[PDB]
Design a protein around this ligand. Structure first.
Ligand SMILES: [Cl-]
Ligand SMILES: [Cl-]
Lengths: 222, 6
């Protein structure tokens, strides 16, 4: 059955927290985070992937670089493109630039992606427990989120349907000795390690799909 | 509940 808690950071699947800066590229960080987890599961090597490669090259698939995008379109680009470059070979500069994809520097691939369906928290829990980190969209458009520091985040103004930010669910847990209450999703953000709880946020779990975390979740197939 | 910065 499903584990009481999961934290893929403790298993080597997750890279250190990154910073998208003033570019609307959270979708690219969410997609490289999911791909980093799946490549690690497949090869045993954790290699940081290039968000800039996605920002600069995936316009044909429907992404708009620093003006926004979608994780599923990014996984589609990696499939059609045949690869994705490492973060070291194609560094992040937080502005839209010319596509400079280099096949010789590719370190990741995908054949498509799987959508978490239904858009229910229990389905997301199954996906997190069996696959690894999962890309998700959420409603991060709140001052309370910008100033979040620690604890379980809950915001009455949060929408489960109108989402504006891509993040990565790396696990789930609970506070205390009881696994069924004070539950939370472990979410990796892309605002730097100085934001939030070391770059992470605990989003309330089993509180009616709070902030939309299970509404548009997906992961690459590697 | 949850804490805010600093
Ligand atoms: Cl569109
Ligand atoms: Cl998406």
């Amino acid at each position: 059955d499903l584990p009481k808690s999961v934290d893929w950071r403790k298993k080597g699947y997750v890279t250190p927290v990154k910073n998208q800066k003033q570019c609307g590229s959270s979708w690219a960080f969410s997609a490289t985070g999911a791909l980093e987890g799946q490549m690690f599961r497949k090869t045993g090597k954790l290699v940081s992937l290039s968000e800039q490669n996605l920002v600069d090259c995936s316009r044909p698939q429907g992404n708009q670089g620093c003006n926004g995008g979608f994780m599923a379109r990014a996984f589609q680009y990696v499939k059609e493109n045949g690869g994705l470059d490492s973060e070291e070979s194609y560094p992040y500069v937080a502005v839209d630039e010319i596509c400079k994809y280099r096949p010789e520097n590719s370190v990741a691939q995908d054949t498509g992606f799987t959508v978490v369906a239904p858009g229910k928290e229990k389905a997301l829990m199954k996906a997190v427990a069996t696959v690894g980190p999962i890309s998700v969209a959420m409603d991060a458009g709140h001052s309370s989120f910008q100033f979040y520091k620690s604890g379980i985040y809950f915001e009455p103004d949060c929408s489960s349907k109108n989402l504006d930010h891509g993040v990565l669910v790396v696990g789930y847990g609970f506070e205390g000795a009881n696994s069924q209450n004070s539950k939370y999703w472990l979410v990796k953000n892309s605002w730097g390690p100085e934001w939030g709880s070391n770059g992470y946020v605990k989003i309330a779990k089993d509180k009616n799909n709070h902030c939309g975390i299970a509404t548009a979740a997906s992961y690459p197939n590697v | 509940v949850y804490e805010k910065k600093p």
